């Protein structure tokens, strides 16, 4: 790919974390804390996963990204829509206004319903993010492996501004402590 010039700079949205995430004072790293971490509830929360969105707001053009998933177990990245459901439970799905990809139990997925077997060789430690807006396209790109192509999204039906997306996973095992960050240009 040559999509690095087409770089933005993302920054966390702390009013729409779930409440047991720390985000941090330059809003670029993102953590699970081990308790509920002193905030008000609002509708914007995420209640039931560990879920942030980034504060841009995109409605044109292409736009790109990078995000260190290193030590990681388990997370999930890609955008979604300033319309999707904050509350309860639901499934990462284009239906319900989400175009993602994760890790979990050791292998990768593209958030399809159903969802979408991955063939990675090179476990990444970075993931690269590109959204075209007109082409309706989502790209992931291997960083640890040349820029390597893991998956697109295309016919993308947006149907509104689209946020950057994270979730950082549970860590009932206590491997999974490690930080989402947002890498410098
Ligand atoms: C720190 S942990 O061992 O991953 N426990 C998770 C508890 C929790 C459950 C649902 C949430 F929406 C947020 C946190």
Redesign the pocket.
């Known amino acids: 790919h040559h999509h690095h010039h087409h770089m933005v700079h993302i920054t966390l949205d702390r009013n729409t974390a779930?409440?047991?995430?720390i985000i941090s004072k330059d809003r670029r790293q993102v953590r699970?804390?081990?308790?509920?971490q002193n905030v008000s509830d609002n509708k914007e929360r995420?209640?039931?996963?560990?879920?942030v969105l980034g504060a841009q707001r995109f409605s044109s053009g292409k736009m790109y990204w990078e995000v260190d998933v290193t030590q990681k177990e388990a997370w999930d990245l890609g955008v979604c829509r300033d319309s999707v459901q904050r509350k309860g439970q639901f499934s990462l799905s284009p239906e319900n206004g989400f175009w993602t990809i994760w890790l979990w139990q050791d292998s990768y997925e593209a958030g399809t319903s159903p969802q979408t077997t991955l063939h990675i060789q090179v476990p990444p430690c970075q993931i690269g993010i590109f959204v075209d807006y007109e082409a309706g396209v989502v790209s992931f790109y291997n960083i640890t492996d040349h820029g390597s192509l893991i998956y697109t999204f295309s016919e993308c039906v947006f149907a509104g501004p689209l946020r950057p997306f994270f979730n950082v996973?549970?860590?009932?095992?206590?491997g999974?402590?490690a930080p989402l960050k947002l890498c410098p240009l």
């Open positions: 779930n409440s047991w995430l699970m804390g081990d308790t509920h995420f209640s039931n996963y560990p879920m996973g549970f860590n009932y095992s206590g999974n402590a």
